[model samples]
Target chain A: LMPDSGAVFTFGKSKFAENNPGKFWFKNDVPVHLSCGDEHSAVVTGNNKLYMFGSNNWGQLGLGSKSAISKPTCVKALKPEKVKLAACGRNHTLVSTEGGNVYATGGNNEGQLGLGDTEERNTFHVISFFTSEHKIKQLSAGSNTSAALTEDGRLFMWGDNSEGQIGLKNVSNVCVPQQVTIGKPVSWISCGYYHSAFVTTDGELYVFGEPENGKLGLPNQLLGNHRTPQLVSEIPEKVIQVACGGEHTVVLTENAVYTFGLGQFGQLGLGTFLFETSEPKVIENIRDQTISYISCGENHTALITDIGLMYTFGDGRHGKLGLGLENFTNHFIPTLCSNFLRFIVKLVACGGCHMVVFAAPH
Target chain B: KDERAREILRGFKLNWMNLRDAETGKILWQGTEDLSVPGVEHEARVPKKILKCKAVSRELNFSSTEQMEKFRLEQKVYFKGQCLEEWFFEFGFVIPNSTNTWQSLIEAMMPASVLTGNVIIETKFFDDDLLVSTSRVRLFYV
Candidate 1:
């Protein structure tokens, strides 16, 4: 889906089973938020129930057991308990329960469980020390690690820190959640494969972690992996939202979605097929429209508009862009997938390969 | 007649299977096929020729109440490719006596095929009342 002025375009993927992938409609039924993992997808209904489908080989389905499922299944442990939001890594899954508790399960081989061990678990386990009073406001997962924001504007990280993805001072793995004491109240957080970025309540943007290929937004000479969060200067606008792909970053402001880092797959939405960018550049043509939400896959980007219009750029392979073509030869500009579907989409989420969206139930 | 029938019922042998993955030298699946218990009427009318079967233990005696209870709880039942032992009980009935009870046991034995496994089944008698017929089922993986 691509972003437009007020409305968003909804696209459908080819049906491989009795279920059609692109069946979203607005008013009668609109998505609230969406997220995906390597081989699975998750959608939070307007009613706040998290529905998950696809692979559960590693308990990614959040069904309390390791079993493969081909249909949408309600995360049993998460049910009865309302989930405000959820995030998925390549193999692990995280959820912010309605009571403000953060629950994690699946693929803890890298300590992503934040339970301080590498033991993988299938049941939903609470992250100790984060009490109901703390209240997790937002959550994001990278390739192996994860980040979370508290109501007090603090940021905490855990899991794989090989590339300093945890934003810590050292390269040690954080099996449990640790505070990223950067002195700033973080309002938003996003993670790439091996890096992380955040916007402070003051609107300042800070980035850190593996900076290979100019992903850190620093100049060429300053390029290298950063173990601690470093402020990215020179942007005059207040960053409202940040989304990360494999090695690229996108920031959405009132005007446009600014992109940096790898663009080989045109994931930057900059209309160029370049490999890397050290500075942020505005995506062409849509700067005048209100860019509401932005999400990224390994090689694709999705954006939603105020009026429920969705646009996509970059690699369309596997229909990542929802444009129907498996492989588009050229760097894609924002293209509309279809016009039959329209609604107010509030949130967008993407994983290594798939994209999900949450729209207002029409 | 009751004693002869008991001998015939004990004649059935359990069957079990060891799971394995073809691609990798990993054991992936395992299960036991439990022989359905013969009907009470069949047990009451034991056939003379069947009583001569070697699988039937004629010397097995439930003379003592304590001995009968112990036998009901710890007895080992063998089936094709699978071994069944009573691991747990609740109201004398196995908590989960489904056909696939031994799936976890098979999975534990073969770590390579963590993706799949099979079930095992064991049976137990209620008390020392030879006339009062009751049995318990136990399920496991390996």
Candidate 2:
């Protein structure tokens, strides 16, 4: 096997960014998965080790401290388990192991930890609902929400549902796992700051939660059903994945990348004139390229093309877009990240004010 | 050309404004005139035009235990640049000056006490003995 080919690169405010707004990387380990919260990050290594850093105000780092970490700190508590998936929220984190066991830490004011309590945790706390039989495939965390998708396409959500963000209708914040189903198995899922979405086995897209700012990608009449998941009939093609931002959504179909909702900061990638749209619109500029992956920050969007190139737009502040140290701006169109021309980007995740990319040297 | 260079180095206004939250579009810190916080003047409002940036503060040393404790109790200090509506140069500014002149200007904008590792300056271009231009001009103390 090629020697640990991937390195973790970080941009934006966290200590991982060092002192500047440009990109910085750590070559000591090979990161396989990455997740970014509003002010924190989680990097899952190839050896199944979880390294966390950034804002720890609510002990979100799971390092048994409240001080912000400038360096990648291993969670010794999880060393005994083979970590598989990790998701970072605004003030909390959710992690799942290969044994199908899920644990949570950090902010839990709304019981995001799924421990049947609202108290925040400084260490990994197991969620009793998940057992070895679950076979979790992915984990996602939002502003105050958490989600886990099982291998069989079962989607379980917890934490705040104040705006139906967790797909629970008119219910109080949940402290335990609640299964949300639309009959078909979910292939992919994403939780934004105030919204959530999922793709079905049939490639259909469904959205829920805060319906303002046209983020729901639904018309005004259908927006009233924001409390429940509704099918987005706007796109004719089969949607493969969906990523929700603070107030926008990016959808990847078999053929194109479509975006809708708030583009006040050009997060929509719809160009200068159209800042917002309730209906999904194709990003005409990069329509020719085949996009393989997508990630969204509170106000930014990142796309990894099939060729391992990355394009970022929206809130260029803090150099989070990885554009440059000196010349950075909010891109209304998908601007290629020229820095990665020598590197093949594999994974990318964006947060409130930062971004983490996993790439390998070509 | 030499006179033009001298004039360019002379009247550098070093203008700055309040830091706005990227998400909520709210002003982060509203400094009182008497507070004397760096870049915290009460009159500094969000600029409608493009402006400029750092990620973290450097390790700092405190004069007294009392001061260190107070610093620990204050809000977590992190800095970032606010981008207007949407360009590459907008992320930060490129100021042309020598290292000495740049440090002096930084001091004028921010007191030494407020800076002392709490803020960092990144030198971009250099020419022999003089540091040419630098980026990351605006910063938020939150």
Candidate 3:
């Protein structure tokens, strides 16, 4: 048994593994993807079944009943079918299936379900609007909101709009799919602490919602929340991708990367001692380097290069940056991951305080 | 082709001129400025260059059918950059509950609000062309 922040007990291979009831086997199977909420953990198996464990309060387990399970429990709601992806927010769980259908289960206090109601349900509920016919391609969950991209290049959002996260014309909460009729047809969508952003099909970048501390790339003093999608005025060229953390935002353009918002923990990779920002700033010294993908956790951020290299920044308190040490200090610049994981990384996902990486399928 | 493009641009302000190809009629480029102006040119003028540009069509996509009906009812014009230019139109209806005199009074008041940013100019031409647009106008009570 390895003693970590959470229990890491393991048992050797044995046919009588279950016979020894007191012992639990932390299977050696490598997890392809992982995510966690405030108290629960979710992992996708190699076979595509989503398994959840830990705090199931508010029916986050999706087990058809509102009971917490200590052992690894398969989400029966997604059984007999393959789940392509899953994401966890502060208190909700969202899953996307192979057939382009999206299902959500868990806390709906803020109408994160997009089911047109605030009632919480312990059972899995199909987001009927994103079924096979509509063909949803991707899904993302924020602290209390959600965003999805349709196959036809349209962007849809729901859940809490307190900070204008829904990108509509008002701050009223949206209980169903509300099309974000913004800049252009969007191909990717991402949400931050209380804001949202997307990359259009033409590579143009557009963002809206909470602009507090310049997280939305607007002027720092323009804290007025936006209820409609607005163009990211500062950027000159098209942005290929973007990611949002708890209170910060980042953008990856064709040539370089830009960051703004809370920089208290160095998540912005600007190499500054300051803690936050209110404008789009570039990370100095790494101008020529190319970044292919980026992801943001609660306070940390990660980037993957085209050559299969990984870099991390921000709060590394929980070893979430995979640096192998409990270093609480902030890294204000892009630092390469420990030499061990320098190569063979294909994809990466960041949790509130944990990180997961997928190696190219052997 | 010029006549067709003009026909589409006619009776529309510069804020609502979205020109498309005559044969394919697929929107090439749409903006809020008049395409016939010196700096701006028709999207169809450069066929090779125009075909590559795609304009979002607002006619087929909307939040709801009620939203669509409301826009049509108000004759709301959507300009380029998804801006709402104006929302006002004339309509005649038979009074089911009110008497003829009361209906006449309602009609008289309707024109009163029309003079306050509610009426859309049918004769004026805006300087820019419209690629796509949507209105926030909707009937919440009725």
Candidate 4:
């Protein structure tokens, strides 16, 4: 009903942001896509501009300043490079350029910058040692580590190997982008706090890293700290989507949603449990629903179905779950978040604790 | 359509707006905007993404080591000084004229009321004596 205009709206607490809910605005430059990190956010504009906001205490904003930023600031250092994608870790940021080069900055005490050292950078650096003219396809930044995938499906992982998230045997910290020998092509890859996961094109799920909290779907007492990509033989069906929480993992197959790991706050969505499990457990209640899109926060899970319905479970004192419930810090089972996604839901994304949703045209 | 384009082309169904073959000069109520499409207006009212920045506070108290340049080509910190800063700039904070003392420096490095061990000051040579990544103590309460 209007001419040529647009508006923006938000709810819930934005601690890293300006801390407002009814905030609205029309951006001068239109956005092409976006990505959210643990406590920060990033946007790729239609003009290929990279803008970031939120806590910059560790320089995760890639703004070349260790100061926190409360407004969207252009990452001028990456100008003319055109970021094809960007990923954020606890205190670092990684971006892949159209030229097939990858650059990184921020907390590198653990070598998260993949620069072959423990030096953190407030500005983006080429990670020159690793991307020697290789065309990069994807970039993955974990809690304190980072990885890159080449067009030929080669995987390179570096940074904090304390938990073996590096997927190598007897490796503590990989100061540079060391190629991981996965034997086959990798299609889906995800990074968790202390664990890393991979889903190969052969329809298999493999995991490594700190298996303590059961993030790695395995018998903890047996193969707890899997130092390399160990195949997960538990999942029944072929997985199409997978997401990781701070200490939990949620996966979706054409059949159902499987959850496991730490559920102190009921993020598992299976039930109210203070205990942990390393085995993949199917969420039976919604096994009948056709799950389409899913996103996992540090302690919560949000999902949208093919029928344009949305549901959330887990820690929600801040209402990031969007479930209009009271006095409940954690929802054991998925609760309907009706008011938010009353239309066709397209995507649901979550930072460590923050969450955002997008609904398509009805 | 080519198979390549079909594999990646983004397409949507066209619901209603006016339509007719010229030979058939007949018009069907193919409205537009709110009339034709139920949600296009709201869809048009938004962009793919919007953003806002955020922040936290920090303090810089830098430090360096007398250890080897590569440090044993190993990892066993438990030393006099560890947890070095991210970068090694030539110049650091300019000390105030009145604040010329090590008392204030130690006070800021580890401000624990009940702590004591040792704080070492070792300046090493970067090529037979050039510099130290310069030594100091600072804590980023993050």
Candidate 5:
């Protein structure tokens, strides 16, 4: 079943088996925006109250308690701060405030928090440096790293760089936000589990970090294995958004969706699956539709069209596709989620084990 | 039936209670710690934070005196100063009997103080009717 903005229903292994019952179960409050990590969820309420729920084994919930919970608990520490946006990593959380202050909490084993040390924090610490320098416009977390984009035209990075996801010189873990000097002003950025990518105003794409089966979407190793950002001029088309998956990366253009990386699980959403494709391959199936939004999870990808229809594919084992039990199979091609048959899903977000849809009545 | 079940359950508890090293496959530390290294072992220093360090006993079955029940799982540790143990008790039902008691996962944490010295892990569930089989292991700091 699908959930509307009024009723938030969750499925999958979030609470194990007995709680699954016969159908959809729900929690109160309408989430204006929410982000899901490996096994946790963070919600931003209409009044700017941030509530976190699910696992706390790594304190990812930002509740300051190590006990795992099953209900939504407001993050008491962030009460004074008017948070505008949030992004969750596997075991950490990053929140951007209305005034552009960025705070992070939870696990830091790999330096994901950028606290200048590998110390895990149960309370939120202001990533104060960049928040004061610029009005942080966006925040994103991938695997164990956190990234921020400024309002003007700059990108700041910190946390695990072992995969060079920070787009820096060396492949060492960074403990502070380091600015990436990409020469020209940056427009937007997207992060994958072990890789990151950015776009220039001129539609030039640059990718970096550990290429898990060439997720960077580059040509080939004939040039050199890139640990830093490498330009992919092949995708000369004007880009809209870039969606990063666990094993694949998808880019949406004006009239086409192009993708690269691992397709062992058919996450690329192309008609045919390939292990790794370095060159940008266009997903010709949705070429006719004017795509409005795109998002990715650990192993699945979801996109919405201008008309409010949602299509999802790749590893639908956990009802992750919201297509119900009938479409549990890993779809090689994009499948229209039947749950949206009754409602028009305006926005969609995929969690590691479940999917959240901001849908309304048709 | 009751005699053999208790014997094996005691054995299963000992196997996991023992912690070992990767390279040597030898015991690094047990249910106890060494005084010299007793300064502190933060979660970050450990490669994998969730170590296989769990205590076999709890307050549920070990607290009630009936079925009627009598086997109390008490922990006795030798330390430098005072050691605070965080006993996390979860609610659940168990056989609590000799015929068949299900095995369970365990976890316990003691404060940084009293971390110095050998840790004597002894869970000798005795009731006078069965064998005096106890799980005793000397855990120390390297």
Candidate 6:
């Protein structure tokens, strides 16, 4: 592969089954958005086309078949629509198009598809609630939850609320879209396995849901508010982005990257001894670099700097860190992804057992 | 009965063998922390109760047990503290006396090739009764 062109690379457990991180590319388009759901992956091309691959046990691939795809297969059913962004859940997928329409597919035991039904789908189904008025800027999916953040800072969530992951009070599940706000506009949103978080336009962060392992970033005294969006006051800076993992949470700020929650495998990047914490702890190791993007898997974390450098930490299983280590060992601190030194990292998405990175020539 | 049919497997051990890269030939070993140095022999760091085995594909004959019924097949390996033996491979079953249980047990844990890769297994039996066996498997695609 040429180091001077844009390419797609996959790591950890995926259909491609590369032992280590390997690279692939598109025919004539470039990836604009990437999302990895537990075991499935979705890639949106610059030409407004959607491509999906990985486990389809519940037809999450949206390929009109329940068969697993080993490569990036375009969703022909959605060819008529100009795909904008896509999000994959544990067993479902949510897609948004340039027309400002939102669609969902896959498992619906808890009505995750937001299609007003509990039946699983083998193809993309439009969510009737969404229209051009919504103006979606991003989409996020969790274990059994779905969320969409509009360009105007409106956040809507659906699916399983058993643990209040969707920020619905006293509700177990919802088959329709419902707005979740703290009386302010939400600029960013992320759905973890059983928890969810969003950052307001004013740069304040709030979290809710199964608060175990301190994944909610709330203090012990205020943990009872797991069903509501509670402010995470520990982070005093302007929160730019927040990504939640299976049991951990990572935040990016102008000064440094803050991490908390379960780090048994070094997901917290707080070193080996301090594996868990509820407070947002800044990663002191990489304070010198200006981080522009941050992503988290079920048990790992990834950060891309302003210089297009990538750093990964946590469970190094299956060479997911892209550190080129044969003897996979958990890293307790942020380690630079040396493989991408020759390429400029553009986008990255981490899933339960896999990670996908999009890079361009340096 | 054939010689293989006479043997019964009570349980088995699973070790995460290296996953060698198809293109680069680099190896990714199990992510178990080795606290002990090269010369020193320290066993305290090695957890004794770190193994957790459960059925993957089908309900086992021993599904009546508590742990077996609790854990479903998981694709990712998790850690508890510093112990790394929690890859879900430590359950036992009722001895398949009249039939060959090995075939069924192996297939149960074998993941679909599309999910990962072709799983190659190397087995070692501790006794003729098959009281305990170890399966060192590798994750590599052709």
Best by TM-score: 6
CA-based DockQ, model 6:
0.04
Q: What C-alpha root-mean-square deviation, in Å, does candidate 5 show against the real structure? A: 12.3
Per-prediction TM-score, please?
0.66, 0.73, 0.63, 0.68, 0.71, 0.75
Error of 3 at B94 (Å): 74
Output the worst ten-in-a-row residue range by lDDT, candidate 1 chain B.
B40-49
Best by DockQ: 6
Compose the digit string of candidate 4's lDDT tens values, residues B4-79. 2222111211222232223332221112222211212111111001111121111122222222222100111112
Q: Once model 3 is optimally superposed onto the true structure by TM-score, how far is the C-alpha of residue B10 displaced, in angstroms?
A: 85
Cα shift from native, residue A292, model 6 (Å):
0.3
CA lDDT of every candidate? 0.60, 0.73, 0.60, 0.60, 0.64, 0.73
- Ten contiguous residues with the weakest lDDT in model 3 chain A: A6-15
Candidate 2 lDDT over B50-121, as tens digits, reads 122221111111121110111111112223222222111111223333111111101003322122223333
Descending-DockQ candidate ranking: 6, 5, 2, 1, 4, 3
User: Which digits, one per residue and each the tens of the lDDT, describe model 2 over residues A287-317?
Assistant: 8999999999988999999999999998787
DockQ for every model comes to 0.02, 0.03, 0.01, 0.01, 0.04, 0.04
Q: Select the stronger candidate by TM-score from 2 and 5.
A: 2
List candidate 6 stretches off by more than 4 Å.
Answer: A1-4, A17-21, B1-142
Ranking by lDDT: 2, 6, 5, 1, 4, 3
Q: Which runs in model 4 stand beyond 4 Å of their true positions?
A: A1-13, A16-32, A129-137, A220-225, A273-275, A324-328, B1-142
Distance (Å) between predicted and true CA of A27, model 6?
Answer: 1.2
Candidate ranking under TM-score, highest first, comes to 6, 2, 5, 4, 1, 3
> Whose TM-score is higher: candidate 5's or candidate 6's?
6
Model 5: clashing residue pairs? Answer: B34-B141, B35-B116, B35-B117, B66-B69
After superposition, candidate 2 runs with Cα above 4 Å error: A1-4, A17-29, B1-142
For every model in order, the fraction of real contacts preserved is 0.00, 0.00, 0.00, 0.00, 0.00, 0.00
Candidate 4 true-interface contact recovery: 0.00
